[PDB]
Amino acid sequence: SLGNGPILNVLVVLGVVLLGQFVVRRFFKS
């Protein structure tokens, strides 16, 4: 939201991606 500050969109996308990668790798480890 707010074109002046579009950084919010970046933060949310990054969070989702990180969570997915972490959980998948952890399961494989065990």
From Swiss-Prot:
Domain notes: Intact BH3 motif is required by BIK, BID, BAK, BAD and BAX for their pro-apoptotic activity and for their interaction with anti-apoptotic members of the Bcl-2 family.
Cell location: Mitochondrion outer membrane
Quaternary context: Homodimer. Formation of the homodimer is zinc-dependent. Forms heterodimers with BCL2 and BCL2L1 isoform Bcl-X(L). Forms heterooligomers with BAX. Interacts with BCL2A1. Interacts with RTL10/BOP. Interacts with VDAC1. Interacts with GIMAP3/IAN4 and GIMAP5/IAN5.
Tissue spec: Expressed in a wide variety of tissues, with highest levels in the heart and skeletal muscle.
Membrane-spanning residues: 7-24
Annotated function: Plays a role in the mitochondrial apoptotic process. Upon arrival of cell death signals, promotes mitochondrial outer membrane (MOM) permeabilization by oligomerizing to form pores within the MOM. This releases apoptogenic factors into the cytosol, including cytochrome c, promoting the activation of caspase 9 which in turn processes and activates the effector caspases.
Species whose genome carries this gene: Homo sapiens
Protein name (Swiss-Prot/TrEMBL): Bcl-2 homologous antagonist/killer
Family: Belongs to the Bcl-2 family.
Full-protein residues shown: 183 to 211 of 211
Superkingdom field: Eukaryota
